[PDB]
Design a protein around this ligand. Structure first.
Ligand SMILES: OC[C@H]1O[C@@H]2O[C@H]3[C@H](O)[C@@H](O)[C@@H](O[C@H]4[C@H](O)[C@@H](O)[C@@H](O[C@H]5[C@H](O)[C@@H](O)[C@@H](O[C@H]6[C@H](O)[C@@H](O)[C@@H](O[C@H]7[C@H](O)[C@@H](O)[C@@H](O[C@H]8[C@H](O)[C@@H](O)[C@@H](O[C@H]1[C@H](O)[C@H]2O)O[C@@H]8CO)O[C@@H]7CO)O[C@@H]6CO)O[C@@H]5CO)O[C@@H]4CO)O[C@@H]3CO
Lengths: 293, 293, 293, 293, 293, 293
């Protein structure tokens, strides 16, 4: 931080004494169930070597967790969001560049606990007949406990370039009615993957044996609201002061199936079964400082 | 945050050098027990590409946790709030759009603790006769603890569009006199769902064997106070500068019933038995910058 | 801090009453998969004995965790990032100096828990044949629990001089599907190093038995985004007011090999097998207060 | 705090309505591997009874943790930093005085847990022959658990006078691959001091059996970056308005030796074997309000 | 807090619209190893009923933990700081008064954990000879855990008057190499007081069996830095506008003696064997707003 | 909070654009060992319906923990502060009123931990003779833990009226050398009340068997510093613009006595044995805006 290097806070930040032009662009993709919103800001700071555009991709991608197929009371399928994605990309011959973005990938940590114990204990025994007994024994215990936090979904910054940047919020793991956690690869020789299995031996129809969406991650059903920012820089002398940028909102769905084995329920999960992609092109005009779609 | 992208804090925010028109609108629905209040704010920032309206839905929906039926003395039913809802909807022909909203769904997390342990120990017997014994043993343990928070109610942002947005505060689970927690599906073969059961074997009538509201989540009785914000954008060039919007407050009630088996109490819960819907039409005038109902 | 020595906050900071000249310079290295971005700030504060240039090295170095080789189906290798580095170097004939930098090395801590516990107990047994027999016993135990946090990667400031400075974010240790944590030297006689081993006895081919990137540190694949700052001072009277500086972005990759032993999977790790070095020269003009490349 | 004594916050602080003159002085000692940087600030506040100079000593002292000796494959020695020092000294004739400094020594704390627990347990036995048995026993136990944090290195303000002040960052203790923690006096009859011992009885050479620096405190190798402030005051009537002051950066290295005993590795540590002392004289001109070396 | 009584924050503080006169006075007492610094501030706020002088007593009192006594290879003495004191005193004739001071005494707390646990447990036996066994027992446990923090030294505000005020930072207790903690009265029938004992029975001179100062509170050695504030009020109409005040920095040292008992080390601690007192008279001129010594 | 009700923060606070008159009044009662200080602030905000006076009662009441009687080595009594009090009272005929005060009584809380655990365990014995048996058992355990903080002294706001308000800082309970905690009612059939007993069976003068004041709450000896505020309102039309108000500082002391039984020490505590009351009248002049005594 500036203070660590003996500099007045904010001194090197950009935007002071600059008339900032902002804008909101909302698009709703009915078929893909995605509310796409771009909030932009043109920052042409004259003490900065380039014009800047801050593009904030927000809105929300519906989870769309749902029973899609019910082919018999013994077999049913559930489609669910295993990944949400937002991507911005500048066409190959664009002189403008991707300069920054937030959030980014943070280093995860884990707490380690190592414990060593050992003790002693005696024991004088006896009975009515008169037998006087005794005992002496030692003991040693060594063990460790590993602690770490696991978000239901991971927010990851995809390897960016000067033309493209993106984030993917992927299903990590989840607790099912206090059990697990389970993930996309969880497997029980008897029950298979119990990720969204409501009951193991219940008697209802397969289509009714899936976990209640309210008892699972809210992102699965109601959806995820992106809140990403990317800064694009542009040379004032660049010959073409108009830039095109394509934005992808995406949802990757897995297929979780339940079938009755005549004795109990067994679940299966198939990865990236479906993919819903909504693309939108925005036009950036660095002279009028406006962004449209 | 702006700091992470080397930009002066608040540089890209909307509002500066703008006269903002605010307003308050209160409506009490007696039949539905809802105090409905709209706090609005027009922000027509000329450096922003569109007119903006921030609508904050507040007030409070009474819980109405009450004993409604009493078929005799050994059976009675309790009406309780399993969900509170607030929705705003723009008629499909409006050019104005829902651009943002808050709160949104946040990713839940859980803490995982893995523990491994190994031990050694010796034992040396004894007794008056002069018999000396021995003992050498080992042990291994591989247990793990899972930790997470469980709010009595979850605040969920429903999948929005550019015309409709809503929230639902749904009952999640609750503690009943230190036991449980219990939820809408809890089931014991003997006592059924004990969600709001005061006693297991009391000799009182059914109507008097429901948990005292003061010992349950206060939202169940006194109520929930929404505090949601919806942002609506409007083209300044739009021919029609008036917009209609409907705001709906709802309460979904479950039916928790108790009956005497002959030896103990047994409860059952019927989901979404009743639904109290309170809708209201508001007029938004982007030119006068006022909202009326 | 200033307040700790009775001095008004901010009093000794640099930057006040100074027009700061900032700039952004972006470079993408396709071959090495590195998005390199320099954010600089020239601070020529006249109450300071020197001109300053704050150089923030950001961008993102792709992790590139991937299977690079596979011989048959029982042998395969995985290239992964064990180190990410950023270095700045001023030529020996330069009069400009490296004055500060951030972050720096933090002093690690650990928590200690010492446990001592005494205990005694009485006992009395008996049978139908009226046999009375008591038991008196005692016990002690010394325990020690050690606690500390372990980041997946450590961020380290390398020993700087007045002409060179660098940082290295190195792989420390990582949790593999709840087990471990494992590091570059972990070794088990039967399984070898299980760092990125998916299964111990799986029947799939080697290339398919590597931990899924989504289930490992996000730096390994998507990558690491540097956020380091370098401060360079320049004498206003130096004959030469132009400085060249070389910035280097690197990725050191280890080679994690898996092979079937006819009975189970066994892995090995080879350190620093590959090094991707991306260097670029920038020109610093202290007079025009601009940096170019 | 000032609010505790009903005084407007910052009212007694120094620096308002004063032009502060600052400066940076960087020196790199190659022989001792020390990047030395002085950041000074002259505050001649006229409502203060004396002139003020704040000298911040920063830069970085390399750790220099390295294998220095190799006599065969059974013996080897490691040089490592047990202390990093920074000292400032005014020659005794100077009228100027050291008035303040930061950081200082803080009172350390510890947590105490007393656990008294009572216990009662009975029993009933009955073999398949009609024989009955009983058991009644009690138990008591008093446990104590001590908790406190131990930084790898302690940052200490040495006893100052009005002519000299200094800090010493000394090696405290450190975890070795989850064991320990070990310190400079750690001793085991078998392995001796295992402080930096990689393996107890590995087959490699002595020079290859030292802990990976990356697995040890980063200060040991990469180095320590001082961040100390010294405040010096000066009478305005002082006849002589120039002051000399020496600044010494120091590193004390221990000698850690490992030798093969023919059955297992044994470690030995020799304290303060080497001292690297880098001294430099600066000139303080209270009139020109500048510092020079 | 002002906001708690509906008053704008700071509305009540003293000092606004007032030119404050500050000063620094440094005195080094070599024989007593005390860096004594007074930082004062005169606040003559015309809207306040009296003149204010805020005296801050800082600097640092050297710890001086040392093996000063050596009476052969079986006897040695360590002199250590059991208390540090700072006192300010106005003569009985003075009209100026002590009005406020900081820090003050804070109410300590303790955490209480009351645990009650009980349980049952079945058990069936059976040898390959047809003999079946049974077992049924229960248990009850009642135990409490007391938790609290123990600073090495306690900072205490002595009972002030309108003429004198003072502080004392007294040794509380301390952890000795993972054991204890020990205080000034710790007594063991075999080892006596092990406060600063390094080994129970190591074979070395008595002068070498004392705890390394680096392994004990740094206040014992390097020293304590007072940071106490005293506010003295003066009536603007008082005949004499000059006040004398005596400031005393003091150190009380205990004597920790070690001696071999033919088999082990035994320790004793003598309280307040030495009291190092450093007093200095200062002159306060309320008309000139100057403090001198 | 103002923000919670959509109002600009601080918008409703009192004191803006108002000249505030403040003052200090110091009184030392040697007989009662009480430093009494009043810090007042007249706030006559013309946009507020009444004149306002903020009276801050501070200073400090000496604890006075002391051995007062010694009737032979087997008997001795200790006087200690079981309560400290501060009260302000306006004679009944005053039109001025006590409007607010701080601190107030806050709702205490506790943490509840209910643990449910059940398990199974198999076994198989054996003897070189050829016998092969086994033991199968189960177990259950319901245990709960209660957590809460217990300050040594409780700061309580006494029931106020519009003519009188007061606080009491009463002794709650205290840890005695890691045992207890003890309070005024603690009673042991063998030792009686051990609140301040140094040793249970110590062979020394009774007057020397009281706990060292440094090992007990510092309020007991050095004392408590009141830091209370009282706001008084006054009608501007009131015909009499002078108000009298008495401030009482008080200390209540218990009597803790230790007598040798013959085999051990036994303590006894007599509640509210003594009461030291220091009263003083102040004159409030709402026109001159000053407080005098
Ligand atoms: O009996 C003394 C103890 O009693 C009280 O504790 C009760 C507690 O307040 C209740 O909430 C409940 O606890 C349950 C807990 O809430 C559950 O989460 C679970 O616990 C698991 C842990 O979550 C999990 O991480 C792992 O735990 C391991 C630790 O992570 C690891 O650090 C180590 O623990 C050692 C401690 O580090 C060390 O300090 C020392 O602990 C002593 C305490 O510091 C001391 O205060 C006192 O504890 C009181 C406690 O304060 C009361 O509130 O004595 C302790 C001595 O043991 O030693 C620890 C042991 O080595 O190891 C642990 C175990 O591997 O696993 C656990 C489950 O095993 O379950 C809990 C039910 O036990 O009940 C407790 C007890 O009544």
């Amino acid at each position: 931080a500036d203070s660590d290097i003996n500099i007045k806070t904010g001194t090197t930040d950009i935007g002071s004494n600059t008339t900032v032009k902002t804008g909101d662009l909302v698009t709703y993709d009915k078929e893909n169930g995605m509310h796409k919103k771009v909030f932009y800001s043109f920052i042409d700071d004259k003490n900065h070597n380039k014009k800047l555009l801050v593009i904030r991709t927000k809105g929300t991608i519906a989870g769309q967790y749902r029973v899609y197929s019910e082919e018999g009371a013994n077999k049913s399928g559930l489609a669910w969001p295993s990944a949400f994605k937002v991507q911005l990309q500048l066409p190959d011959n664009e002189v403008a560049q991707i300069s920054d973005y937030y959030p980014r990938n943070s280093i995860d940590t884990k707490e380690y606990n190592s414990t060593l114990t050992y003790g002693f204990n005696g024991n004088v025994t006896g009975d009515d007949t008169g037998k006087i007994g005794g005992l002496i024994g030692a003991n040693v215990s060594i063990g460790h406990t590993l602690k770490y936090v696991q978000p239901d979904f991971k927010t990851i910054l995809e390897s960016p370039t000067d033309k493209k940047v993106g984030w993917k919020v992927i299903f990590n793991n989840m607790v099912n009615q206090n059990w697990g956690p389970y993930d996309r690869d969880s497997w029980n020789p008897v029950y298979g993957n119990q990720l969204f299995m409501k009951t193991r031996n219940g008697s209802m129809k397969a289509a009714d044996n899936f976990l209640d969406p309210n008892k699972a991650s809210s992102l699965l059903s109601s959806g995820f609201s992106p809140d990403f920012a990317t800064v694009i820089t542009m040379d004032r002398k660049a010959s073409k002061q108009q830039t095109n940028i394509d934005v992808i909102y995406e949802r990757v769905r897995d297929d979780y199936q339940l079938h009755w084995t005549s004795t109990n329920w067994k679940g299966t999960n198939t990865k990236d079964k479906w993919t819903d992609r909504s693309s939108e092109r925005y036009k950036i005009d660095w002279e009028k400082e406006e962004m449209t779609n």
